[PDB]
Write a protein that holds these residues in place. Sequence first.
Motif, PDB file in Angstrom:
ATOM      1  N   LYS A 245      -6.633   8.411 -10.045  1.00  0.00           N
ATOM      2  CA  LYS A 245      -5.682   6.955  -9.540  1.00  0.00           C
ATOM      3  C   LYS A 245      -5.577   6.059  -9.058  1.00  0.00           C
ATOM      4  N   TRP A 246      -6.960   5.810  -8.528  1.00  0.00           N
ATOM      5  CA  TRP A 246      -8.157   4.566  -7.885  1.00  0.00           C
ATOM      6  C   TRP A 246      -9.027   3.806  -8.987  1.00  0.00           C
ATOM      7  N   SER A 247      -8.077   2.454  -8.857  1.00  0.00           N
ATOM      8  CA  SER A 247      -8.682   1.614  -9.875  1.00  0.00           C
ATOM      9  C   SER A 247     -10.286   1.308  -8.965  1.00  0.00           C
ATOM     10  N   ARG A 248     -11.731   1.359  -9.169  1.00  0.00           N
ATOM     11  CA  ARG A 248     -13.075   0.537  -8.754  1.00  0.00           C
ATOM     12  C   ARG A 248     -13.486   0.038  -9.449  1.00  0.00           C
TER      13      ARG A 248
ATOM     14  N   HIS B  23     -14.135   2.363   0.894  1.00  0.00           N
ATOM     15  CA  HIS B  23     -13.996   1.053   1.423  1.00  0.00           C
ATOM     16  C   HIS B  23     -14.345   0.439   1.207  1.00  0.00           C
TER      17      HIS B  23
ATOM     18  N   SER C  71     -15.817  10.293  -5.112  1.00  0.00           N
ATOM     19  CA  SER C  71     -14.960   9.006  -6.142  1.00  0.00           C
ATOM     20  C   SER C  71     -15.069   7.893  -5.535  1.00  0.00           C
ATOM     21  N   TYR C  72     -15.225   7.192  -3.821  1.00  0.00           N
ATOM     22  CA  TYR C  72     -14.589   6.029  -3.244  1.00  0.00           C
ATOM     23  C   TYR C  72     -15.084   5.441  -2.326  1.00  0.00           C
TER      24      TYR C  72
ATOM     25  N   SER D 275       1.043  -1.192   0.001  1.00  0.00           N
ATOM     26  CA  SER D 275      -0.287  -0.239   0.018  1.00  0.00           C
ATOM     27  C   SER D 275       1.315   1.281   0.379  1.00  0.00           C
TER      28      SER D 275
ATOM     29  N   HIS E 110      -4.666  -1.961  -0.234  1.00  0.00           N
ATOM     30  CA  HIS E 110      -4.906  -0.557  -0.674  1.00  0.00           C
ATOM     31  C   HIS E 110      -5.798  -0.609  -2.639  1.00  0.00           C
ATOM     32  N   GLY E 111      -6.512  -1.875  -2.514  1.00  0.00           N
ATOM     33  CA  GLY E 111      -7.045  -2.010  -3.896  1.00  0.00           C
ATOM     34  C   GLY E 111      -5.917  -2.634  -5.137  1.00  0.00           C
TER      35      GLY E 111
ATOM     36  N   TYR F 280     -11.153  -0.593  -3.525  1.00  0.00           N
ATOM     37  CA  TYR F 280     -12.190   1.125  -3.548  1.00  0.00           C
ATOM     38  C   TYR F 280     -12.883   1.070  -4.258  1.00  0.00           C
TER      39      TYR F 280
ATOM     40  N   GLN G 207     -11.217   2.275 -13.969  1.00  0.00           N
ATOM     41  CA  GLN G 207      -9.351   3.890 -13.468  1.00  0.00           C
ATOM     42  C   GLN G 207     -10.894   4.792 -13.457  1.00  0.00           C
TER      43      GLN G 207
END
Length: 1070
Positions: free
Chosen positions: A130-133, A101, A98-99, A14, A42-43, A69, A127
């Motif tokens: 910077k978060w792959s959801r 957890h 955005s997200y 992470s 984390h993701g 995420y 994406q």
Amino acid sequence: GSSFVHLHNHTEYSMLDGAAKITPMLAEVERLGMPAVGMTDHGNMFGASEFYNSATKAGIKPIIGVEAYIAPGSRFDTRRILWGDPSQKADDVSGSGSYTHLTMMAENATGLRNLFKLSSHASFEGQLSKWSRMDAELIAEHAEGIIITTGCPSGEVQTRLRLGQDREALEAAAKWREIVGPDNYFLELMDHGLTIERRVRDGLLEIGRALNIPPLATNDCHYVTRDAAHNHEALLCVQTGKTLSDPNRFKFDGDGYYLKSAAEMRQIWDDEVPGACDSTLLIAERVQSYADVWTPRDRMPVFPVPDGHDQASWLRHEVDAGLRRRFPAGPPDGYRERAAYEIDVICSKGFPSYFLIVADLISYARSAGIRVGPGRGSAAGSLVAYALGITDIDPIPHGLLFERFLNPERTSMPDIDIDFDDRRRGEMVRYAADKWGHDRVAQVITFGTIKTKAALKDSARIHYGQPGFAIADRITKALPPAIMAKDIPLSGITDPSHERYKEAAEVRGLIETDPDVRTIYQTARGLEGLIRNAGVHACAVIMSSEPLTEAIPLWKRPQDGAIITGWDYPACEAIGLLKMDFLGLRNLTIIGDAIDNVRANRGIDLDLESVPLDDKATYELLGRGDTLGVFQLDGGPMRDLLRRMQPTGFEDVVAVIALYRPGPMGMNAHNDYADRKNNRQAIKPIHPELEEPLREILAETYGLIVYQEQIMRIAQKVASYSLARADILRKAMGKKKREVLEKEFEGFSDGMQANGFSPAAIKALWDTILPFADYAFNKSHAAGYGMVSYWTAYLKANYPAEYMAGLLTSVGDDKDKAAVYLADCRKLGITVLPPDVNESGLNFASVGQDIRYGLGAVRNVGANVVGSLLQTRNDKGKFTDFSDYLNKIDISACNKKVTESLIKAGAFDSLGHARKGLFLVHSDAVDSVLGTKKFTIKVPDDEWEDKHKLALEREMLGLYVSGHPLNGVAHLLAAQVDTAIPAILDGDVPNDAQVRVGGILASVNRRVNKNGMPWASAQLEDLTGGIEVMFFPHTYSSYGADIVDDAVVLVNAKVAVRDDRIALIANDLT
Ligand SMILES: CO[C@H]1C[C@H]2C=C[C@H]3[C@H]4O[C@]2(/C(C)=C/[C@@H](C)[C@@H]([C@@H](C)O)OC1=O)[C@@H]3[C@H](O)[C@@H](C)[C@H]4OC(=O)c1ccc[nH]1
Ligand SMILES: [Zn+2]
Ligand SMILES: [Zn+2]
Ligand SMILES: [Zn+2]
């Protein structure tokens, strides 16, 4: 009933958010006597391999999951969706809408597979920033063998309850619960000592009761032991980009986020919530082994063959055709026999397909006009290779051996590495994808780490902000120099025991006597050995016979949509995936460019295949040591060795590469080769008894042991070893396992004895080999890389001007390499012409016996600006004057910055305006014309001073081309200088005599001796030639201020002669 398993932990994967490295972490789990541990990063699932390996060795059950995420709505939709009114800003969906957890863990092997897939779909399809959801939609499809919880504060249930949306919270729980199942849903309770957790406590326990969700305790650990929490805080500042002093920065509140003991955790939860702790144990019993994911399998592509054939037969056929093409009138004696032997080995080891794949890749490339290099590494030693076209070096003439490349007795896999030119390496990766599949080819990850130089710079930023870079620079540039690439550890500077303590004195001086430096240093020590960021492997391509997604986790680089792999190369290969290495080489590109320059400047069409290996001209050059710009032979040392060796044949070239080895310089092998050859030293038999057996094997190298191949043959003659067994002996001797190395003597001794050798001779050979057996080179590599060295040398020798143009083009970006090469051109006699607006192109051009500077290589000027400039000239006239220039150009090329650069470089000199004049007028004029676009502009007659114009020109061009500083001052020095540089070089002057030389300084180099006292070495070049000067630690202090490049100086030195080098040692600079 007395222990606790932790199911929510974060490792260092992470990135810049977790601090717990896996071996320290597992040490603590043991001491606290807990059955199992978990990892939930984390993701990503990027650290699953290291974790599984380490836990199995140390006897702890591994649990692997991810902290996802999730997205408020659809993964594709990229609109922020806040859930409440404006005032409740800081209690809403995280990352500004955005997200949210979620916690997921893999119960079974099936589960781990599904989790790898979900993670991949997220980078591909969901994406945002910077978060792959993931989203609720994805998870339903791939949901067997996974276990989920109501989540941390930042999860959905808890965010809803915080804002007061209580019915809405209940709805969320029921949604997620249905997706996974009754048994796979747990309620997560954590206590760290804050209110935000406490208010909701009643809320959470309520939901649980209504929907019959069992409870679970977790601690959300980001570090191992309490003392560390200080460090976690500096780390968060690296990720978030904000200073420690700043009030509003992201932070954790109080040090409770660590691996607590079982006892600590039972008191806190066991009284109020009954069973929170016991369920942690129940989960751990359920997890099953994840070994199947890691069991090795055969997954190499199968090459398609025409009908009535198999892989084996086709290999044989393609070999036969290749032999005919190379030898039109019939293969020489024995070539047929070698081929049949090798084919059987490859076929027995079941690698026919591998050879055919590599062949097709080379053939496609040859058709398309991409240059491919002669050979790299160990592959030049196979005949099968030379026939198939992969290698262009013949095994049998030069003596290279097959057993080095593939050993019959051992079990391993062949490794061929191929060089393609720098510019077009990209096409090759694409083509491989086209041929084999888009779902079957990928590039490979690297994990970057913080070492000494990096940690100094991260620390300066967090403490002192973006203004901190200057201080970090000073400390970093004052460390001692590095041995290979590796540098003195941070602990080392202040610890007496460590070997390099003496060397590091200077930096320590500052640490002790400056507050700021000392503060930076203390934070730094904590930030070391930690993963900083992801990267991509420079050469590797992985290939498979099945879709990659069924084996490993994958990701997509956002910028270009390239697929990359989750795990790194050691890890991928272990389960049985094929790695191929396509390397980039820039010398291959230079060769292409010089050939093409000749075709235009002269008329010849040149084919490098048919150049003889015995050209007189090449060897005169190598022998005079004029090798700047030749592959591998650039260094100051290697030039001196070539001078002494005076090479005569191709064999001398293959050798010079292998004898400057880190052993041989000090172990003094390179002085011997030079002298024995030139009859200054006499060949020495190792022992009287063994001269005659080993006369031929060692004759080429004048009696020395230089190559690994020489060693394997010795074993064959004297001790009657099969070449396969001789191969194992070389490897073992290298690693020095003492027990085995001892046994090695037995076999060697016994064999020589049966042949009929003395006890004394047996002892002698063993004794000689062990010193020489960690510094022995692979001959295949030197032959292949020797060729590229020879080709470069020939082209430089026969066609001087055309070659230098190819060279200078490649080094446009790096202004330090360019400086070296431009001075070389001057001494050789070539004239480089200043850049120009109307008569220059992007790249340097050979025009008769001169070269014209390329526009693409001025500082601050880019490809796109110059591209536009040229088209304007093509279409709408020559540029008559400055005004005309301003009128015609498009908007993209109207930048103030571009214009000033070209003014200082001299691009407008032909048009006749003075350089200073243009500079002052440029600011206003650009604005006026740019205004119209959305004029007779006068030029003043003022000009910069000679020195200053040249200084500025150097800045933009890399070195000055228009003039040379000494021009115009050359006579001045002459009056005052007692001794000309030529005389002293010739050897006219007696040793150890006072002298007063004068000139321009060049190539100042900074050096530090063992006790750590800085000193400097420089070249005092005048009009013709130069002699090296050395300023010692004491000298460096008193007069050390003026030792900077391009300064006209007067040096008082002492003539010093040693080992055929004449130099000056100086004390006073005026
Ligand atoms: C992992 O370590 C590298 C070492 C390389 C490092 C420095 C140079 C060094 O060996 C390198 C290299 C690519 C070696 C190959 C054996 C190759 C193996 C995997 O096949 O790579 C390595 O061993 C480089 C060069 O090509 C050869 C000729 C060597 O160059 C010199 O020693 C050298 C000295 C002076 C000029 N060249
Ligand atoms: Zn975190
Ligand atoms: Zn969380
Ligand atoms: Zn977490």
